[PDB]
């Protein structure tokens, strides 16, 4: 199938090594990091969006981190 839906969330797990665990553990975070480096303006845009919606620092931080995790991943 398409790589967009890997078989990582199913509850089935065991002692043995899963297929491509080493790469797939950090593949998504590597993609997010490289997207963030490639397009740094959206960091400013997400900062603005979090600052104009988050009253508390917890709210602002969670909105900023979720927004910086969605855009590289939802692309």
């Amino acid at each position: 199938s398409v790589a967009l839906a890997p078989h990582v969330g199913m509850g089935l797990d065991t002692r043995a090594q899963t297929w491509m665990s080493a790469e797939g553990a950090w593949r998504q975070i590597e993609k997010v990091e490289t997207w963030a480096f490639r397009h740094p303006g959206f960091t400013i845009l997400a900062l603005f969006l979090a600052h104009y919606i988050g009253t508390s620092l917890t709210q602002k931080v969670v909105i900023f981190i979720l927004l910086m995790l969605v855009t590289p991943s939802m692309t």
Binding site: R15, Q17, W19, A22, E23
Partner: peptide, 13 residues
């Protein structure tokens, strides 16, 4: 260069 992307090494336990 960077030919490790098309090979996966797996441990049998």
């Amino acid at each position: 260069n960077k030919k490790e992307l098309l090979v996966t090494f797996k441990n049998a336990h």
